[PDB]
Every structure is written in C-alpha cells, then in structure tokens.
Amino acid sequence: MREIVHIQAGQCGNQIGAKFWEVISDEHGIDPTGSYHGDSDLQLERINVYYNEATGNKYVPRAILVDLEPGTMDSVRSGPFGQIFRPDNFVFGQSGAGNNWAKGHYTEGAELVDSVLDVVRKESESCDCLQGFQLTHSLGGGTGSGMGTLLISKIREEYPDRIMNTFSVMPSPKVSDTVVEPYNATLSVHQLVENTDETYCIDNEALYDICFRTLKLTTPTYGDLNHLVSATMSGVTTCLRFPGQLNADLRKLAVNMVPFPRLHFFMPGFAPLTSRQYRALTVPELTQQMFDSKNMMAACDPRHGRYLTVAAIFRGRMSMKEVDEQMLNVQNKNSSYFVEWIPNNVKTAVCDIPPRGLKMSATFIGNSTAIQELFKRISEQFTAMFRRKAFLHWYTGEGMDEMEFTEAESNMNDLVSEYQQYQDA
Amino acid sequence: MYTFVVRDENSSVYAEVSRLLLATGQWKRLRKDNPRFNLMLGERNRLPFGRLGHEPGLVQLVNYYRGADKLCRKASLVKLIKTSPELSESCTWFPESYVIYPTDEREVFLAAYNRRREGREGNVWIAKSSEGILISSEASELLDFIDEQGQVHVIQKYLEKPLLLEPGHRKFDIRSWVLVDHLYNIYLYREGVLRTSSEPYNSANFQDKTCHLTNHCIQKEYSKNYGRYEEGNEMFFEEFNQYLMDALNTTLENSILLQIKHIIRSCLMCIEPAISTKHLHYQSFQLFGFDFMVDEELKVWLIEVNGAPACAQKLYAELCQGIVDVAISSVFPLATSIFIKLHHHHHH
Amino acid sequence: MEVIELNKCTSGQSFEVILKPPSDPSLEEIQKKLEAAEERRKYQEAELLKHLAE
Amino acid sequence: MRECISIHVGQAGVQIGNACWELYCLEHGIQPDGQMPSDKTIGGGDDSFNTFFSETGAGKHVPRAVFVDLEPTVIDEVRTGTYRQLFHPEQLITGKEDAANNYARGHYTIGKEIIDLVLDRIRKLADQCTGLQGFLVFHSFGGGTGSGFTSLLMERLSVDYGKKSKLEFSIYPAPQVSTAVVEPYNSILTTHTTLEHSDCAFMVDNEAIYDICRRNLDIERPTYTNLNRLISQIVSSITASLRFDGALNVDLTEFQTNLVPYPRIHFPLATYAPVISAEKAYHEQLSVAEITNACFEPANQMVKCDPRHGKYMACCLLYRGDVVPKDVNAAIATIKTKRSIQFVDWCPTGFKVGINYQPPTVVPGGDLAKVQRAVCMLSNTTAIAEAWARLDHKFDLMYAKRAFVHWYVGEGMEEGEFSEAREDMAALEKDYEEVGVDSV
Ligand SMILES: Nc1nc2c(ncn2[C@@H]2O[C@H](COP(=O)(O)OP(=O)(O)OP(=O)(O)O)[C@@H](O)[C@H]2O)c(=O)[nH]1
Ligand SMILES: Nc1ncnc2c1ncn2[C@@H]1O[C@H](COP(=O)(O)OP(=O)(O)CP(=O)(O)O)[C@@H](O)[C@H]1O
Ligand SMILES: Nc1nc2c(ncn2[C@@H]2O[C@H](COP(=O)(O)OP(=O)(O)O)[C@@H](O)[C@H]2O)c(=O)[nH]1
Ligand SMILES: [Ca+2]
Ligand SMILES: [Ca+2]
Ligand SMILES: [Ca+2]
Ligand SMILES: [Cl-]
Ligand SMILES: [Mg+2]
Ligand SMILES: [Mg+2]
Ligand SMILES: [Mg+2]
C-alpha cells in the first residue's frame, strides 16, 4: 500500500484537482518546476504516495488530467503549477459533453476512455504496490459526471482488487449552471454506490453558504469555493501523505469508515474556516468547530442523524493529551449522536505539520446517516422534472431509455432508506 | 452535564433518585445500554461489574457493591458470621443458626437441639429461605419442610421472649437504612421504622403466623387489626422513643441504637477488604436495609441484611435526597446531616 | 506454612510455600480451508466481472 | 540446555520484540554488534543464555528469533536500526501490502502466499537446535497480521512441531491506542482458532499499560515506545528463568505444569511492581513486603480485573533483586490475613517462588528508575474472564447488525466462522464461571 493514482475529469474536477496539487506540493516542499526545497524530512518520507521520482530528483505527480474539451486543461497547463504535470498524462478531446451525462458515459466519452486507460495502465505498471485510485469531479456536468463514472467502471474491471476513492462535487440550485444537474447527479450516484469504496460528498450548497454566511464573501466565486475544497482535500489525505498510525492507507480507511458496502458517502469538515487571520486557535476550539454543522462541506444537519463512524485529524504542534481529552469530551457529551452498536467509532490522528497559513487545524470525516438529506434533495429536484419527462430529449437523443432513469432513481431512494434503517437501529 | 443510566425499573428508591437528578438540570439520562455514563443505577441480578471502569474520560460509579451478596443472602450471612474471626462463633448478637440443604450442617444442628431437649430450655426454631416459613419446637417437622422445598434453607433460633408494645402485647422488628459511599464511610439514616405486628403475641400456637411475622405484607392481608395503633403498622423513632421513656424509663439511643450501630459497623467492616472500591477502576456505593429484633432484656438481634431495600413512604423524599448528596454528588459535584457516620477508633 | 523444594545457586534460589492443602488438524485439512476460501474469492470476483461485462 | 525460538508477528509483535531483545542484550552483556566479552566459550556452548542466543565462530551472539510482518516499514526499522548487526537477513521477513486490520485478509488471503516461506525460515533456526523446546509467539489481537496470520502459523506449528510447546504474548485491544473499529472481531476470531494450539498465553491489555504509564511514570500521553519498554520488563521477568540459572520454570513445559491445570484456561494474569519514574527526584526504595503487597492491587495488573471475585488455580512469584525466602514468607503471611485470596478446592493454597539476585535492568535514558528489588506475579485467576466479557460484548453489539462483516466475507471467509468463534468464547466464559463461582 504505497502509490495512489490521481485522476481529474471535467471542468470542476480539473480546477479543484489543480488546486489540490498546488496545496500539497507546497506542504511537501515541491516547487512548480518539481524540485524539492523543503526543510523537514517528514515531507519526503511518504512523498511516493502521490509523486513519481524522475532524474535530477524531480518529483512528478501521479496525476492524469481528463476532459472532453481542451478549454479548462489549457488553463491548468498555464496555471501556477501547470508545468509540474507529466505532459503525456494530458488526455483530452474536442467535442465537449454539454453538461450531458449520456454524452460523457455512452457516446463522446466512450470514444476517449480507452486512451485514458492507456495512461492509467502506464502509471499503474510502474507502481511498486498500487493501493488504488482517487478521482476528482463534479456530478452535475457531463464529462466529470458521465465519463468519470465510466472510467470508474472500467478501472474496476481492470483493477477489481484495488480501492476506488472519489472527491465528488454535488450540484446545488444556489450554485447552478444548468437545470439538468439533478439528472446527471442521480445517474452518477447510482454508479458511485456500486463502484466506489469511499466518496467525500462536497456540496456546492454548503461551500456557498460557508463563503456567504461565515467568511462574509458577498459574491462567492468558484475560486472562493475551491479554497475550501483544496483545504478539505489536503486534510482528509493527511494520514495518507505523512507518517502515521491511523488510516495511513486507503484500504485501512475504508475498513474503519465503512460498516456496510453502500454506505460509504462521507461528510467532510474543516476548521478553522479560512478565506483568502492570526487567531491562535486552542484545541477545545478546533474540536468544537470541526464538529460544528457550519463547518461541514455537505449541507446536512448532523443532529438529524447519527454517526456510524468518524475520523478526526489534528494538524500542528499541540498537546496530544488535550486532543484526547477534547475528543472524549464531545463523544461523552453528545453520545446520543453516535450509534451504540459500533463501539469506539471515533478514531483520531495527529500530524506535526500544519497546512499553509495556520498554526493549528482540524479535519473531520464523518459517516453520518444525515447524509441522506443530501440525496433526498437531489431526488426531489430529479422527480420534479422527471414526472413530466422534462429535458429528457437531451438524453434519449444519445440512446438512453427512460427506464434507465427510473432505475437510477429507485436505487438512490433505496440508499436513502438504508440510511434511515440504521438511524433507527 | 453528568450522565447516568437506569437498569432497574422496579426500584422505588432509585426511581426517586432518578427524578431528583433530572431536577438539578445537571444530570442527563441515557439509554440503559449506552456505555458512556458516569453513573449506573444497575440491576439486581448479574450486574456486569466486569464492564465498568473501562471508558476513558469517564469517572464511573455504580449503586451496588460487588460481593455484597455475602451479607444479603440468608445462607451466606450465616456462613460469613461463623467463619469470620472478627465475627466468630462467639457472636452475641446473632441468633444460633445452621444452613440446611434439602456443605450442609444438618449433623451439627441436631447436636445443640438435643441439649435443649435435655436442658428443658425453649427449643423453638424458625426455618426460612433467601412465603416459606415454619415455626416449631419439633426438629422432625423442621427438617421435613426443608426437604419438601427445593432450595437452601436456614434454621435459626426463634426468639421466644420478644419485647412487646403495650397496649397490644404485640411483636415488631426494626428496619435501619445504611448508606455506604465510595470511600466506605458508613452512614446510618437517623430515621428508622418499626414494622409492628397488630395482633397480640402468643407462645402456644406458633402456626398462627400473623402475630409472629411482622412483615408489612402479611400484616396488611392476613391480619384484621392492620392500622389500629399506628398508620399501616409502622411506628417511627420519635414515638417509639417516647414509649421507651414512659414505659421503661430509658431512651432509644441507649437501650437499642448503640447495639444497632455496633452490629451494622461490625458486619460491614468484616467484608470491607472483599468489596471495597478504594483503588479500583470503578467505584461503588449501596443502600442496605438491616432488620433487627429486640428481646425483653432490651438486647438487639440481627435478622437479615437487605441489599435492595425499599423505604417507608414518608421517608423517601429525605432519604433519596441524602443518597444524591453523600453518595453521588460527592463524586460528581453540582454547580445538619440526615445521617450518622459510623466510626470508632478504640486503641489497644 | 511449609517451605519445600528449596534450591539454591550463585545467581539465586527458588522454593514453594503452601498455606493450606487441597480442600489438531492436519496439513491437508488446513490447505483445504485456505483453498476453499480462495475459491470463494474467485467466484465473487467472477460474478463481478460478469456483471461488469453485462 | 534446550533452545527456544521467538516469533514476532505484526507491528505490535515486532516492536515489542525489539524492546525485549534490547533488554535481553543489556541483561546478558551482549553488545549491539553481537559480541559478548563475558562469554569465554567462543563459537559455541550450552549455557542458560544459549536458550535464546546462538553463536558464530566470530563470537557473534544471534537471537533465535523470527520477525514477520505483511508490510515492510516496521521491520525495515530493525534492518537499519541500532541492532541491525544482531539479526541475520533471513530472520527478517516482510511482504508488500498488509492485512488492513482484517483477520480474514491476514489469515486466508495474504497468509496463504507467505506461510510456506515463514515455516521454512523457522525451519532454518530449528535445524540449528540440539533440542528445541518450542516457541514464544508475540502478536496483537487487533491487527490483521497479528490476529489472522498468527492463527494460521499456530495451526501449522502444531503440525510441523506437534510435540513442542507454544507460549503466547498477546496484546489485548484498547481504544486509547487502537487503530481499528473491528479489533473486537479480530480478537475473537484469532482466539478461537488459536485456542487449542496454545499451551499458555500471557495477555496484556494496552489499557492497563497505558494507565500505569500515566499514573506511575508521569507520562501525559504514552507512546508505543513507552508501552513496549514497560511490557518488555514483564516479558523479561517471565522468561528470565529460561535464560538464567535456577530451578523454577526452567523449560516451556513447566509453565503449563505450574500455571495451567486445565488446558483451555491457559491465560495467567500477570502483575508487576514497582514501576518508578526515572524523573522522580527523590524515591524511597520499596521493601519485599511492599512490592509483594502491590501484586494484589488491580492498578498494577497487566489486565484490569478483580481477582477477589474469582478463584486462583496457581500462583507464581518471580523476584529480581535483593530478596531472600525469609522476607517473602513473612510478606505472604501478612498479606494472607489482610486480603481475599481463595483458591479452588481442588488446588493447594500456595505460592511457587523464584528469586534472581540480579535486580531489574533498565534501558539507559528510559522512563523506568532502577530499583533494588522488583517482582512479577503470575496468577491463574478466573477474574481475567472479565476481559473476555468486555470483548465479547463489543463483538455482539456489532455482529447483531453485521457491521463490517462484508470486509471479511469479501476475503473468502464464511459468515459462519463469526458465530463459531463467538460460540467458542461463550463456552470459554462459561468454563471460567463454573471453576470460579459458587451458586449464590
Ligand atoms: N503495546 C503495543 N501495542 C501495539 C503496538 N503496535 C500496535 N499495537 C496494537 O495492535 C493493534 C493493531 O495491530 P497491529 O499489530 O498494529 O497490526 P498488524 O499486526 O501489523 O496487522 P495489519 O492490520 O496487517 O497491519 C492496535 O490495537 C494497537 O493498539 C506496540 O508497539 N505496542
Ligand atoms: N429468628 C427469628 N426469631 C423470631 N422471629 C423471626 C426470626 N426470623 C424471622 N422472624 C420473623 O420474620 C419476619 C421477617 O422475616 P426476614 O427477616 O426473614 O425477611 P423476608 O426475607 O422473610 C421478607 P423479603 O422476601 O421481602 O426480604 C420478622 O419481622 C420476624 O417477625
Ligand atoms: N466547486 C466547483 N464546482 C464547479 C466548478 N465548475 C463547475 N462546477 C459544478 O459542476 C457542475 C458542472 O459540471 P462541469 O465540471 O462544469 O462539467 P464537465 O466539464 O462536463 O465535468 C455544476 O453543478 C457546477 O456547480 C468549480 O470550479 N468549482
Ligand atoms: Ca466522434
Ligand atoms: Ca559461548
Ligand atoms: Ca497442542
Ligand atoms: Cl515434534
Ligand atoms: Mg461547466
Ligand atoms: Mg487501445
Ligand atoms: Mg501492520
């Protein structure tokens, strides 16, 4: 369990994916040219998890960039860390997907998917011990949604014994491009329920509310939203990128977080919430905030459900004793919100290296049954249109039948019911 | 905010404790299977002491002493007294008792029974199990009823010369409530009760068990004078004391209570090293109910110890408050004591 | 309180004190279990690749 | 002289093994490079220390140990560490990917493709023995390797060395340092499969070691380094009789004879004292009576339980330091009249005592202060069944919902093995109750 193969698909996937590599490259002391200029050796002890090592001790991200149009991928190549990425790992078409899941999954993406798998295969063959894949994408578009889930199905066929992880961005009407986003999302969730081990549910609804209500950003941009995502992604991958005992690899994380195969949709949290402050935050303050609903990246009330499992990660120099005390304090004072039939379902890790700009930070990963509120929301938006078969001609024109929409709906409604089952157990 | 759990729904005492705790607004009740608790109001049977004191960040307390059943079982109590050097066979305040199975002591029981057949002495004994009582001077009868049953019984010398309340010429027993906290401080509730008999005692017919058994249950049913002299055959200390002062020219403290405090302390200091939670990973407290008898010589006799006692109706409010004050709030502080601390350090 | 079997040497000594007197599967079977588990894995994987093939 | 082979499995087993052999070397005066000046028989011999060490013509003293771990990072630190010279490369065995805290993955999946290698590497050591006693196996209950692979190894060792004895040093799971939610599952599973193949197993609850470190060593948040150095002292006390001159517990067979009358009930409770902080500026050294009295305090046990509410089947007192039989008997006499110590009717109420004049050795720069006398009591009490009750309860809570079960089934295991293992534990809990409790 060493190498992870990163993939980023579509506009959203490549933009958040780009920021992700900008952030962790800084943490690991890698510069835009791929040279190491760090001070600590904690930075290079598990660098091979995400980076391949070339001659001159250059470090190249094990990342594959995918899109059905060259637009966003031209921007990435011109971006801050644009030149770090392996040129051959840029795989793109020309037609685009037009925010159509069917196009990314069945027609346009089918034409491009084989060339992506050729790059995935190249990377995988050089891995001493490939542990799995992590994908970044949105579910509301066409490429990242349609082709992303197609890649996942293909990767599982060729690598059935490796972990499949995803950072999936959920669509919200408050931050919407098109009206067919619920369709694309529902079709995608059906794929994710079956073919992933662990999905970090990142709700654009939540990212917007945080920027608006908390960070006091009157007019949030996608750039502002991504500041939060890149911070969350850096957090939840901390245990993977640095020396540690708890959840140090993708498989061990899945075993601790996933009591049932389908219930692997996680609610990420982060503290302190930052925007592009010098407040010295105490451990009790980190613990209170990371568990605060206003710090959750999925617009769900944790008090409306129960925690099946939780993974907390504190970063920075702090009292190990105090961290343990506070983590026990929240459990004991809110024991009703943690299921009693999974004893000690809250595991905690600590890393001496904090993220950029902060002295102390805390990342929260929770498998709550309250996540059903997210899927319920999409289901209502879905049904509102589907009952009148509105905007379906975009999909039937690509060869899809209405039956496939009906099935995808039923399976997501089942997922909701399964969460409700264990919320009352 | 402290947390607790209830695992004994049939406990009147700790049902009131549960109520009082909630009223402080600083105690929250969890589900009875939630392990993250500070306090357990546990069950009577097979309380899982083995699962206590293994929750990080929680000082855990329970309302029972593991191993306290040694004192609260008929057969166990007899064995404890006769085999414990600090109690010994030379125990002046416990009636002559023998454990009988349907090891056994049937052999030795008859030995002393003969000296009373020979010695012309009152050879009456009572048999009981830990319903199911018989009183007779004939051992042949006693041993038969035990065999007719299917559990362990104990034969005990029946006090034929009990003290009798006048007017009435009637029997009684004293009930004292003792609280042992986590520090093993022995607290005697200053309010006891006399479960009196409402029928005149009669040492000619030991089968008419209504003037012989002072049980509030047997009295409220089988007796026809229930509630004549006192409300529900329950005389309290203020009255019983005045009676002793007027009739016998003595006080309750002197003539009886000295012996009671001696017996309570002697019984609990005996088993202390076997049940103490001084250096344990969890801690225990418990409410006990000692039952005593008083002969005509104003000598006190221990009958039994109850490990799960109920209280007198008008004494619940005061007693239950005292339990929270001394046994619970002592370990879990909130934001003229009703007890007498039993201690004595005689140097020799 | 009786001491017995007292043994002494340069590096130490040992004894006993009494306070009161008295009042497998074969290699074949293992390999079958490991293989039976291996085949159950192969079946579950085959069912997956069959589902994906569809 | 008869040899003993140590076997260390998984992170816990390996890292504890490191601490033990570090301590063995200091106690025997063996340097990191394997040389031992005090040993005058160069290139061989059959002294008591040769039970754990072999010899080369160069004068190198090599542990009769095998380290196994399904991933390399931990054992790699041994290959590069202070005692890199001490071990021969073939003694250190590593896979590529681990069992991911999954018993089934460690037992069935990954266990199958490395088991033959391990046995052959053990066979290499066994061939160097003139009269092999048996094996000491160190591992954790919670880990996938420590639980899954160990059970497979214990089964095969009973096939290839059916006449040899097998002792366990098992780490019982504790949430304060646990790394998985499914450690209860792995524990019941490995205990069930290992039960018939183990002759005597010493359980160590990390909870107990953790609080002893907090309480007596003033360590705010103990690390595995703190835990292992303490654990190694207890292991040293237990194995000292195999490595030094004496007449009590001089072979692995005698451990079973003295501590285990009933074979299934083979989990002796260990109690150790005194544990003193090296940072403690002023310390009054404790007497024989004081440390012997401490052996009956739950706060000093390797597992938190209450021996008062159980019964003893055997009791061994292992002293190290300034101790003579007269002081021991005086202490035991005093203790017997102050504490609740009830044996089973079919056993004598007594203590088998062993004394080594050499006091405990401590690691330089370690957390433990050097004391002039210490003791480790090994008592087979039924009260240790509390640990089984704690474990089985957590098991029942999760299994009732089949939580995480799919991870095991996915590795080829059958859901039936869960209930079979649990049923075995139910029988075990019942056996303890019959022996230890009277009908109230
Ligand atoms: N006392 C002590 N316990 C340890 C140590 N290392 C791990 N543990 C415990 O062992 C349990 C996990 O088992 P491990 O030994 O780490 O796992 P493993 O044997 O390597 O098996 P894998 O799952 O394949 O990695 C946890 O509950 C830890 O608390 C150690 O060095 N000392
Ligand atoms: N040795 C004795 N001599 C005289 N009377 C006795 C006696 N032992 C018991 N009694 C009578 O029996 C009555 C109560 O019996 P005991 O004291 O055995 O409680 P119990 O166990 O019978 C009721 P519960 O089942 O509710 O605990 C006493 O008040 C007394 O009248
Ligand atoms: N957080 C975030 N979400 C985005 C971004 N761009 C698009 N989205 C969301 O993703 C959905 C559109 O999918 P998109 O990635 O643009 O189409 P694709 O290129 O076919 O994958 C919409 O619901 C948007 O809200 C971005 O930069 N950041
Ligand atoms: Ca085309
Ligand atoms: Ca030699
Ligand atoms: Ca055997
Ligand atoms: Cl053999
Ligand atoms: Mg777009
Ligand atoms: Mg091709
Ligand atoms: Mg491991």
Which residue lies with its CA nearest to atom 11 of ligand 2?
A: B213
Of A14, A67, A138, the residue with max ligand 3 atoms within 8 A of its CB, to mutate for a pocket test, comes to A138
Breaks after residues in chain A, judged by C–N over 2.5 Å? 276
Neighbours of ion ligand 8 (CB under 5 A): A 11
Q: Is the CB of A177 under 6 A from ligand 3?
A: yes
CB-CB under 8 Å, B56 with A324: yes
Please give the sequence-ordered ranges of beta strands (E in DSSP) within D241-387, or none if there are none.
Answer: 269-273, 312-321, 349-356, 373-381
**Sign of the four-CA dihedral B191, B197, B200, B201:** negative
CB-CB under 8 Å, C17 with D245: no
Identify the three-state secondary structure at position C21. Answer: coil
Q: How far is it, in rounded angstroms, from Cα D49 to Cα D55? A: 11
> Closest ligand 2 atom, CA of B217?
26
Q: Can you give the residue range of the structural domain that contains D21?
A: 1-268
CB-CB under 8 Å, C37 with D412: yes
Consult the annotation and say whether D237 binds a ligand.
no
| Contact predicate B125/B156, CB 8 Å | yes
Q: Which two tokens stand for residue B346?
A: 């005689």
Identify the three-state secondary structure at position A404. Answer: helix
Residue D254 annotated among the catalytic residues of the structure: yes
Please compute Rg for chain A using Cα positions: 20
Other C-beta atoms within 10 Å of B155: how many? Answer: 24
Q: Which two tokens stand for residue D342?
A: 């009830």
Breaks after residues in chain C, judged by C–N over 2.5 Å? 23
The answer to whether C26 faces chain D, any CB pair under 8 Å, is: yes
Q: Which residue has the tokens 């799919």?
A: D406
CB-CB under 8 Å, D305 with B50: yes
CA B268 to chain centre: 12
Nearest to D403 among A251, A252, A342 (CB): A342
| Contact predicate A324/D381, CB 8 Å | no
Asked if residue D294 and residue D176 are part of one domain, the reply reads: no
Asked if residue D236 and residue D344 are part of one domain, the reply reads: no
Q: Which two tokens stand for residue B342?
A: 């039993």
Mark out the alpha helices in D62-196 (DSSP H runs): 73-80, 103-104, 110-112, 115-126, 144, 150-160, 183-194
Domain boundary among D221, D251, D268: D268
Consult the annotation and say whether D140 binds a ligand.
yes
Please give the sequence-ordered ranges of beta strands (E in DSSP) within chain C, or none if there are none.
Answer: 2-8, 12-20
Cβ-Cβ contacts under 8 Å, D100 against chain A: 1, 249, 251-252, 255
Residue D372, sorted as left (phi over 0), alpha (psi -120 to 50) or beta, turns out to be: alpha
Nearest to B51 among D176, D339, D393 (CB): D393
Resolution in A: 2.7
Backbone phi and psi for residue B182, each to the nearest 5 degrees, phi listed first = -65, -25
Tell me the three-class secondary structure of B270-327, residue by residue.
HHHHHHCCCCCCCEECEEEEEEEEEECCCCEEEEEEECCCCCCHHHHHHHHHHHHHHH
The answer to whether D281 faces chain B, any CB pair under 8 Å, is: no
A45-74 in b/e burial notation, b at 16+ Cβ within 10 A? ebbbbbbbeeeeeebebbbbbbbbbeebbe
C24 Cα–ligand 6 center, Å: 7
> Closest ligand 1 atom, CA of D110?
24
Residue A270 burial (CB < 10 Å; 0-12/13-18/19+)? Answer: buried
Which residue lies with its CA nearest to atom 22 of ligand 3?
A: A140
Consult the annotation and say whether D179 binds a ligand.
yes
Domains of chain D: total: 3
Spatial CB neighbours of B207, under 8 Å, sequence gap ≥ 6: B135, B136
CB-CB under 8 Å, D97 with A341: no
Helix (H) or strand (E) holding C30: helix C27-53
The answer to whether D205 faces chain B, any CB pair under 8 Å, is: no
Q: Which two tokens stand for residue B201?
A: 């005692």
Considering only alpha carbons, which residue of chain B is nearest residue A324?
A: B57
Spatial CB neighbours of B157, under 8 Å, sequence gap ≥ 6: B95, B96, B97, B124, B125, B126
CA distance to B162, B194, B206, B292, per residue, from B295 (Å): 4, 14, 17, 10
Other C-beta atoms within 10 Å of D286: how many? Answer: 19
Backbone phi and psi for residue A310, each to the nearest 5 degrees, phi listed first = -145, 140
> What is the least distance, in Å, from the CA of D299 to any CA of chain A?
21
CB-CB under 8 Å, A249 with D100: yes
The DSSP bridge partners found for residue A66 are A9, A91
Q: What residues does each domain of chain A span? A: 1-259, 260-370, 371-425
A251 Cα–ligand 4 center, Å: 38
Q: Which-ligand-closest: CA of A344?
A: 1
Pairing between β-strand A59-61 and β-strand A63-67 as defined by DSSP bridges: unpaired
Instruction: Give yes or no for a cis peptide into A220 (omega within 30° of 0).
Output: no
Considering only alpha carbons, which residue of chain A is nearest residue B59?
A: A332
Pairing between β-strand A4-9 and β-strand A163-170 as defined by DSSP bridges: unpaired
CA distance to D103, D114, D410, per residue, from D106 (Å): 5, 10, 13
Q: How far is it, in rounded angstroms, from Cα D146 to Cα D140? A: 5
Asked if residue D146 and residue D168 are part of one domain, the reply reads: yes
Top residue of B2, B32, B36 to mutate, by most chain A CBs within 10 Å, is: B36
D46 Cα–ligand 5 center, Å: 7
Q: Which residue has the tokens 């037609």?
A: A95
Chains in contact with A, where contact means 3 or more Cβ–Cβ distances below 8 Å, are B, C, D
Asked if residue D196 and residue D59 are part of one domain, the reply reads: yes
Start-to-end CA distance of chain D, whole Å, equals 50
Q: How far is it, in rounded angstroms, from Cα A65 to Cα A345? A: 36
Pocket (CB within 6 angstroms of ligand 1): D 10-12, 15-16, 69-70, 98-101, 106, 140, 142-146, 171, 173, 177-179, 183, 206, 224, 227-228, 231
Residue A67, sorted as left (phi over 0), alpha (psi -120 to 50) or beta, turns out to be: beta
| Contact predicate D300/D271, CB 8 Å | yes
Asked if residue D200 and residue D85 are part of one domain, the reply reads: yes
Q: How far is it, in rounded angstroms, from Cα D318 to Cα D303? A: 18
The DSSP bridge partners found for residue B163 are none
Nearest to A309 among D181, D184, D407 (CB): D181
Q: How far is it, in rounded angstroms, from Cα A373 to Cα A379? A: 10
Helix (H) or strand (E) holding D224: helix D224-243
Among chain B, residues having any CB pair with chain D shorter than 8 Å are 48-51, 53-54, 56, 66-67, 69, 73, 76, 273-275, 279-281
Q: Exactly one of D155, D254, D386, D429 is catalytic; which is it? A: D254
Identify the three-state secondary structure at position D37. Answer: coil
| Contact predicate B198/B219, CB 8 Å | yes
Nearest to D156 among C9, C11, C30 (CB): C30
CA C36 to chain centre: 21
Instruction: Give yes or no for a cis peptide into A272 (omega within 30° of 0).
Output: yes
Asked if residue D333 and residue D284 are part of one domain, the reply reads: yes
CA B348 to chain centre: 31
Q: Which two tokens stand for residue D116?
A: 């033959």
Consult the annotation and say whether A196 binds a ligand.
no
Breaks after residues in chain B, judged by C–N over 2.5 Å? 102, 130, 335
Q: Which residue has the tokens 């106690």?
A: D27
CB-CB under 8 Å, C37 with D109: yes
The DSSP bridge partners found for residue D93 are D68
**Between vectors from CA A69 to CA A68 and to CA A74, what angle results, nearest 5°?**
130
Among chain D, residues having any CB pair with chain A shorter than 8 Å are 71, 96-98, 100-102, 175-176, 178-182, 184, 220-221, 394, 397-398, 400-401, 403-404, 406-407
Of D7, D9, D11, the residue with max ligand 1 atoms within 8 A of its CB, to mutate for a pocket test, comes to D11
Asked if residue D334 and residue D346 are part of one domain, the reply reads: yes
DSSP per-residue codes, A385-403: HHTTTTTTHHHHTTT--HH
CB-CB under 8 Å, A252 with D101: yes
Pairing between β-strand B153-157 and β-strand B134-136 as defined by DSSP bridges: unpaired
- Long-range CB pairs of A191-194, under 8 A, 24+ apart, other chains included: A191/A149, A191/A152, A191/A153, A192/A149, A192/A152, A192/A166, A192/A168, A192/A265, A193/A262, A193/A411, A193/A412, A193/A415, A194/A262
Q: Is the CB of A100 under 6 A from ligand 3?
A: no
Q: How far is it, in rounded angstroms, from Cα D129 to Cα D52? A: 11
Q: How far is it, in rounded angstroms, from Cα B151 to Cα B101? A: 7
CA distance to A17, A253, D8, D172, per residue, from D188 (Å): 43, 22, 20, 11
**Sign of the four-CA dihedral B208, B210, B212, B217:** positive
Instruction: Give yes or no for a cis peptide into D274 (omega within 30° of 0).
Output: yes
Helix (H) or strand (E) holding B198: strand B193-200
Among A241, A229, A246, which Cα is nearest to A353's? A241
Asked if residue D301 and residue D178 are part of one domain, the reply reads: no
| Contact predicate C3/D330, CB 8 Å | no
Start-to-end CA distance of chain B, whole Å, equals 48
B2-68 CATH choice from 3.65.10.10, 3.30.70.360, 2.40.30.10, 3.40.50.11480 = 3.40.50.11480
Identify the three-state secondary structure at position B167. Answer: coil
> What is the least distance, in Å, from the CA of D221 to any CA of chain A?
5
Asked if residue D414 and residue D288 are part of one domain, the reply reads: no
Q: What residues does each domain of chain B span? A: 2-68, 69-70+163-342
Q: How far is it, in rounded angstroms, from Cα B36 to Cα B28? A: 12
Q: What would be the CATH architecture of the domain defined by B69-70+163-342?
A: 2-Layer Sandwich (3.30)
Q: Is the CB of A97 under 6 A from ligand 3?
A: yes
The answer to whether C12 faces chain D, any CB pair under 8 Å, is: yes
Q: How many CA atoms lie within 13 A of A195 on its CB side?
A: 25
Among chain A, residues having any CB pair with chain C shorter than 8 Å are 153, 156-157, 160-161
Please give the sequence-ordered ranges of beta strands (E in DSSP) within A126-264, or none if there are none.
Answer: 132-138, 163-170, 198-203
CA distance to B152, D29, D342, D351, D352, per residue, from C16 (Å): 39, 30, 18, 6, 4
Q: Is the CB of A136 under 6 A from ligand 3?
A: no
A10 Cα–ligand 8 center, Å: 8
Q: Which-ligand-closest: CA of D48?
A: 5
A311 Cα–ligand 1 center, Å: 18
